[PDB]
């Protein structure tokens, strides 16, 4: 997996967006938080009809662009089953990071 | 027509539409979308602020998509009334199927 | 520094931090004049032993000009002191659009 981001030049952090399946999470969880990466973010959520709603799971990370690559794929071989339905990650620029501690 | 501006993200594939608005219809704005053939909806409940309940779908779509999806979820969601609720388009750099590793 | 972004004018105020701040950063928000906030709880991380901690999410979209203002006005908010306060993200984003009106921008 090689994610292409040259559409943003001077980007220097980016969020990792994974919708997968629920009992995955743990997984998922266990082998970023081994691999020393924190500030994982979970909501539960749902993804034709509305009965045709299931529950996902969305794990969102913030890194740095150079991370980017490594972190999709820890996340895509946990959540990882070889079924449709696995689920997806999306990659989406960040303009700014906060630290409430120690902000200004 | 609503047309979409683009222009501050050239070269970019991929762009998540995200809408908060009335629960009440979400089935209405779900099929719309599913008839026009879209997959990949996520659906979270969220909170306005007095805090009301409120609706959020968002859906990952090609960027020649863009405007006739908007177009269709804002047509479902409308009522007229104040607090219809809003549709934000976000760039999307990558996406990546988990199951086959291909972005 | 938004210097990565020429030609964006809107940005989504995306900030993570500690359930019981959330009424004092609503109020903040509002006594400031800033609408359109969305809420949602969520949970951070804190097999090998780790523990889903509730926090909450808030969602402000703004135009350029006011991001500074209200990023201040979210950290001052929701800050203790210790360890585990969150954090604030700040996005781009290309469109709005009000469903009432189909008006775009502003």
Same mark, same amino acid.
């Given at each position: ?5 040259? #559409? =943003?030049? $001077?980007?220097?952090? =980016?969020?990792?967006?994974?919708i997968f *399946? ?13 691999? %020393?990466? *924190? %500030? ?6 749902? %993804? =034709? $009809? ?14 740095? *662009? ?15 089953? $070889?079924?449709? %339905?696995? $689920?997806?990650? =999306? ?11 120690? #902000?200004?």
């Open positions: 997996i090689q994610c292409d981001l040259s #559409a =943003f030049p $001077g980007v220097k952090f =980016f969020r990792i967006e994974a *399946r629920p009992w995955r999470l743990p997984f998922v969880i266990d082998t970023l938080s081994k691999y %020393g990466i *924190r %500030g994982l973010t979970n909501t539960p959520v749902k %993804g =034709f $009809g509305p009965s045709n709603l299931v529950d996902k799971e969305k794990l969102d990370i913030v890194v740095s *662009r150079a991370q980017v690559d490594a972190v999709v794929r820890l996340v895509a071989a946990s959540a990882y089953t $070889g079924e449709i %339905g696995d $689920g997806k990650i =999306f990659v989406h620029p960040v303009a700014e990071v906060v630290r409430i501690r120690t #902000a200004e």
